[PDB]
């Protein structure tokens, strides 16, 4: 719709908090598509937030997730 669906965070957040808030690109992508997510829609999510680079997304990366999705979804829409 905008920029992110707050649908996908939920996988993403789902899955993030069976391997203890922190997982890496192998590890959260084998759980995402088991799932039925696509590579293309991980690497872009990945990449997306993998702001550092480090093939890894951890709790930090993943409650940006949740504010982006706010700023754009919340607080504001027609603008
Ligand atoms: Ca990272």
């Known amino acids: ?7 996908t965070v939920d996988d993403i ?3 993030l908090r069976q391997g203890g808030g922190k997982l890496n690109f192998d590890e959260l992508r084998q759980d995402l598509k088991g799932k039925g997510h696509t590579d293309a829609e991980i ?3 990945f990449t997306k937030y ?3 680079g480090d093939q ?4 930090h990366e993943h409650q940006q997730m949740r504010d ?10 027609l603008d």
Not at 56 to 59: C, G, K, Q
Not at 68 to 77: F, G, M
């Open 43 to 45: 690497e872009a999510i």
């Open 13 to 15: 957040s789902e899955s």
């Open 68 to 77: 982006d999705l706010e700023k754009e979804r919340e607080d504001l829409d």
């Open 1 to 7: 719709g905008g920029s992110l669906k707050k649908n």
């Open 56 to 59: 890894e997304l951890t709790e």
């Open 50 to 52: 993998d702001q550092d």
